[PDB]
Amino acid sequence: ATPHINAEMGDFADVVLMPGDPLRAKYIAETFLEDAREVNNVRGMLGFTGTYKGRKISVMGHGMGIPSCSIYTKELITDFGVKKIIRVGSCGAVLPHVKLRDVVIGMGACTDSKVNRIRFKDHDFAAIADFDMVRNAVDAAKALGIDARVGNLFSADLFYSPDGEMFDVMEKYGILGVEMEAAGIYGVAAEFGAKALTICTVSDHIRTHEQTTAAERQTTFNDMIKIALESVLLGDK
Amino acid sequence: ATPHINAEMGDFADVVLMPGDPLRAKYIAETFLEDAREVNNVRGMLGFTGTYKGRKISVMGHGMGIPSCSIYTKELITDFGVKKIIRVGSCGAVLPHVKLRDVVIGMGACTDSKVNRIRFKDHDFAAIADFDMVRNAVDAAKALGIDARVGNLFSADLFYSPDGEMFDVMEKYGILGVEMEAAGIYGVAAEFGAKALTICTVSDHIRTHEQTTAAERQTTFNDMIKIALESVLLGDK
Amino acid sequence: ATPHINAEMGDFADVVLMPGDPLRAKYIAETFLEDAREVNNVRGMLGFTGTYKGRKISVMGHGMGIPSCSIYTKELITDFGVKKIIRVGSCGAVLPHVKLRDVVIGMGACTDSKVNRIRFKDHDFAAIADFDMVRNAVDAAKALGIDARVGNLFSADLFYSPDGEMFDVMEKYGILGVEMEAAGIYGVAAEFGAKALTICTVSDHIRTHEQTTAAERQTTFNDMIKIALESVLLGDK
Amino acid sequence: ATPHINAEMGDFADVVLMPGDPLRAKYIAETFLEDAREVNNVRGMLGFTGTYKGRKISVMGHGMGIPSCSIYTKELITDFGVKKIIRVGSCGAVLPHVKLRDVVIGMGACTDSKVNRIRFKDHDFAAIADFDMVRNAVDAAKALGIDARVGNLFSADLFYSPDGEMFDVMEKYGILGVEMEAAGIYGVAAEFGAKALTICTVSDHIRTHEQTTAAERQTTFNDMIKIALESVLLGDK
Amino acid sequence: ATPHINAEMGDFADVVLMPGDPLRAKYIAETFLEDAREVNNVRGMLGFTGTYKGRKISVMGHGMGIPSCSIYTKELITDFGVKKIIRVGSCGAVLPHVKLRDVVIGMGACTDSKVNRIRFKDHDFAAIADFDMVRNAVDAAKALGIDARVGNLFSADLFYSPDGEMFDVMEKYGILGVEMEAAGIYGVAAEFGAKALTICTVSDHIRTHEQTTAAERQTTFNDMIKIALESVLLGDK
Amino acid sequence: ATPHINAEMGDFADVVLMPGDPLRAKYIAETFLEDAREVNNVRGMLGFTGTYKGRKISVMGHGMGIPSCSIYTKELITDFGVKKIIRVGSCGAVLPHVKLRDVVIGMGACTDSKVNRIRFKDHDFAAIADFDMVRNAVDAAKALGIDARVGNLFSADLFYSPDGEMFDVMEKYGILGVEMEAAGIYGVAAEFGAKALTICTVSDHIRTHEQTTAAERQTTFNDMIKIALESVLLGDK
């Protein structure tokens, strides 16, 4: 057990799905996993382990922000034998052609955080996902007949940005979505030799904001989870 | 209600104590406040309001890391009329003469985050606490007979830092405790016009690795709470 | 005609292969393309346009370094309607398990250059390739019975760096190859909305000089061009 | 004797007041100290020692700018046993509600200098004053019946700044006064192990341009001196 | 032989002229040098060695950009005993009083590149030419009845910069011409203890396109080569 | 009159010699100027105006550090019509072949200050002297039969550097001397359109330190002044 996870080696599957909200982890466990058991509850960051179509899978929250998710993914990788981490969250869109409920896959993640410069001697470290994992996710999406865009995400340190000028910049350089952790997770994955992937559903449009129905948003969130779960099965083959 | 807090103006007191752990907030509400009511549970970030010696007080967790607590402190200030925020967290010590369960008051907070450089045109912003609040905390401690060092804290983005030599640099400059929020809260307090102070209890020693050996509080982590609550009363008079 | 390309709209195909060595441009047109015609000679940077299995394709060198290739790729995209750019070059390896003559595909590219920071408000822009282009290259190689590594490349501004320790850092973070263009090309593609990919052959193993024949080099080089050319057709399908 | 001070251990009191102007030091020695003796004149930086109500005290100018005062404060601490340094200077106001001759106490000091980044591995060092000294100054002011704001100062490298919009940024973050030494002195105090505090008298208003109109002191610049001297006595008790 | 130059010690003179356009190398050997012989062809970068009025001299292009010229100048200095490097190229002007076809000598070179910061601990290294070489060029021009401007050049990493405002800044600080090599060459010369100079002809006036004949261009170009060649002889005297 | 100079237009010559020490200005005035009168004494920074061989010349101190000398040179240029500034000071040497009493001329000046980045949009501004002034100084030196090296100086913000690693770096890149203001003065000269030059005599050897006789050091200091004064006369022709 670690300071943030009160569990023991074996308690987690070698693959962990991670939403930002801990309550969302219980929701995932309850909806898609069979014979699921709770394996952590320290600081309320609920974690579960069960099976998906006979495949052992875990799901646990990582909180908001790079500093927060950096702690959990690191401990899982170095103390619980986790080989793959899949973040499943939400994001805001800046590009006009990107609509609400769009499923985005971050093959890369930009950031205003300084954590990767600290690791990479003040230089530019391209925070990227594991290729095979992105490929498995894209294929799983196609099988479920779901679009899915693959590109850059932007991991912000400030949800409430002091100067909203970066949004024009993000849009200019093709950023698909704005969230708060992909760059941190990709950084730890590279630092401790593991594999990670971030998938998001567009929950708003920075400028436009727009709106839809709850039943439809909830349907789209489940598609994301199904894509994540099915991508793991393809990876096993 | 705000994007991360489902409450209305009036649900929170003008003063809020904030530990990083929502379960510590719950404990604080159950142990020190009377007629405590839960006012928030979104994303599991439990928030409570009650009274301490007739004084209306609130206590809510803020999660781990600057990006996380920046969201919560901001929403409380702009949408719930919160005038004062007192962080009651834990920290790691780097100085040889700093023992576990020691209480520190951060009049200042150093950091390796980029959030304040982003607010201050890439220059050095001295993230400092409110002077009167620091003074109230000092007097509250003396009256309670609890020792408490006043000085600089260091707000880290990476709990598992790649740069171990930076701790030597921290020690050389007299850093009293390493945590993950102070500089960020002080930045928000200044950006949105509110007052803040960070009080911490040494829970780990980065050198000796002696972690929170021997319980998790029982009295000291309670000491921190007594000082915070009593300092608030001095501020009212 | 542009400052560095004396040609008109239509002279270049929507897809262009670009070697670092300008002499390789004519070699490719002669060895792999049919009905090739010269389309540029300014500053001795010979450009050719022809067809590969009916598909229109162009080839022209970009010169060594980010500044140089940034010029050509930009002019090609904004003034000659180019939609995809494939850099075909060489790199040095820092990972012991990455062998000489290995074919690596850069899904991402790290760098010590300032160009992207100038474009991204001094933040971390993740310079990445176009996902489909990466997958096309991986599949084309497999079909050619060639094993290919997909990962991060490092684009150095200084071939003769005074910072020897940086090679240890690159290895620790899994950098597959060191070259001098990818990050610059990926920045341009993002800035002007185009697609790009860099494929490199391991020409040497930094800190471990090993020998290789001239017959082997041509063979590996021809393999890389075949991989790139076949990848374009898959991209069309 | 040190490279810039021709005196011997014992010539200075363990506490030294330092205005940027050597002529102000002379004035202070002649007006407030008894049996004042000149202990230095190298480069014209006049230094004096005498007593205030029986308490041994010294007063020496430090020149304009961080590089200048960094030299003098360092030499005093390492070669003359000086334990406390109180800067008594002038500053420019950016806030609309700050009037000429107002007294400010810098509990913290922001800066555009690079000296502290050079000491703190390019991270953010919160340049702060000694808490007890700040408190002594506050009490000394109350007892004397002099108003005094406690907060952040901004230590500028360029008195004639090219960046005028930075003043708006300073105002937004509540900077009480703009001067040129505080952050540097606090850095030295921390590096060489001593205590410091900066007290300033508003001499200019950067917005209204109303400079030190109406004399150069007569009583207020004397107020600053009374507070400094009296705060020292409180510290001894 | 070096990675980019297939020659041996002695093939190059101790002085080398370097145009950005590789095609100009053969033109110079044919038009100004006597008994020229080819000494390099790797990557199509033709190098020649001959004599001018008995003085041994070599000429070879460096390619566009700091990264490219840094390679060649370095190899020439460390492996071919070269002592002086004179870059002869073109530049764009931002000062209205600097006319088209003007000859400018860069005593210093500003830059937006990171190469020198990597060499100088992230501090400001002033990339300067060799004083005697500057004076030799000024005197040679005067003797040729040509007026020459000596001052600062700006070496840009991006010919197509997204930061349009930077040209206003360069003008305000007196930048005589904008090119893409000088600062890199000056860094190399300083790093390996050699002498260097950059001479450029104003080929265009940024933000003010003006016309010029092809006969005029050759004339000005020949003038620059004569200035450079005659400067070497003065340097010998 | 300005806040730092109590004089009026006409009081200073259009050429001003500036030592760091104000007492050294009186010394220069007394030793080389005829009919010299004091024109400033604010903050003890003595300034004088007299004539040298019929040429009107001024001499005034600038204090230690870039922030200090930046204030004076700026006011002289924009408020007193000064066209040329010549700093005449001392410096420490890092290069072995540079000896005590060597006369160094800084055609360029590196620095760890941030003032030029603030002016040059965070880029590299090569802080250089005016060419004609360097040329006049070199020629004046030759006429007086004095050696004089021309090259880079290093303007340090910290006389007492926290980490003496930069000295090896300075030595590696050929820095002739270490002082504390040239880069600041060259920056203001470029900002307000004036001309400046810095000349220094080596007063110590960072590592070696060495030693000589006072009579000889004083002779060398006078040679420097004579070189400065005579250089002005050549400039008039």
Ligand SMILES: Cc1ncnc2c1ncn2[C@H]1C[C@H](O)[C@@H](CO)O1
């Ligand atoms: C619009 C926007 N900006 C930043 N983060 C966003 C976002 N929309 C969603 N997120 C994500 C990432 C965080 O974990 C959380 C913040 O509410 O949801």
Ligand SMILES: Cc1ncnc2c1ncn2[C@H]1C[C@H](O)[C@@H](CO)O1
């Ligand atoms: C070593 C280290 N670094 C950063 N924060 C640390 C730490 N040891 C303890 N902490 C503290 C601060 C956080 O608020 C908390 C996170 O678990 O513990």
Ligand SMILES: Cc1ncnc2c1ncn2[C@H]1C[C@H](O)[C@@H](CO)O1
């Ligand atoms: C070992 C090494 N380092 C940097 N760039 C390298 C390299 N080996 C090959 N390259 C590539 C990229 C450049 O375009 C060129 C430099 O010789 O070949």
Ligand SMILES: Cc1ncnc2c1ncn2[C@H]1C[C@H](O)[C@@H](CO)O1
């Ligand atoms: C506008 C401005 N900037 C920086 N320092 C200023 C200022 N106006 C006044 N000062 C103060 C601080 C110094 O200690 C002193 C220098 O003359 O005046």
Ligand SMILES: Cc1ncnc2c1ncn2[C@H]1C[C@H](O)[C@@H](CO)O1
């Ligand atoms: C306008 C402009 N900008 C940048 N570099 C320029 C230029 N005009 C000429 N050059 C020079 C330097 C490069 O080597 C090449 C770029 O076309 O010519």
Ligand SMILES: Cc1ncnc2c1ncn2[C@H]1C[C@H](O)[C@@H](CO)O1
């Ligand atoms: C060794 C050394 N380092 C930094 N500055 C030096 C120096 N020797 C002389 N100086 C100069 C510049 C300052 O104005 C003053 C500092 O004593 O002398």
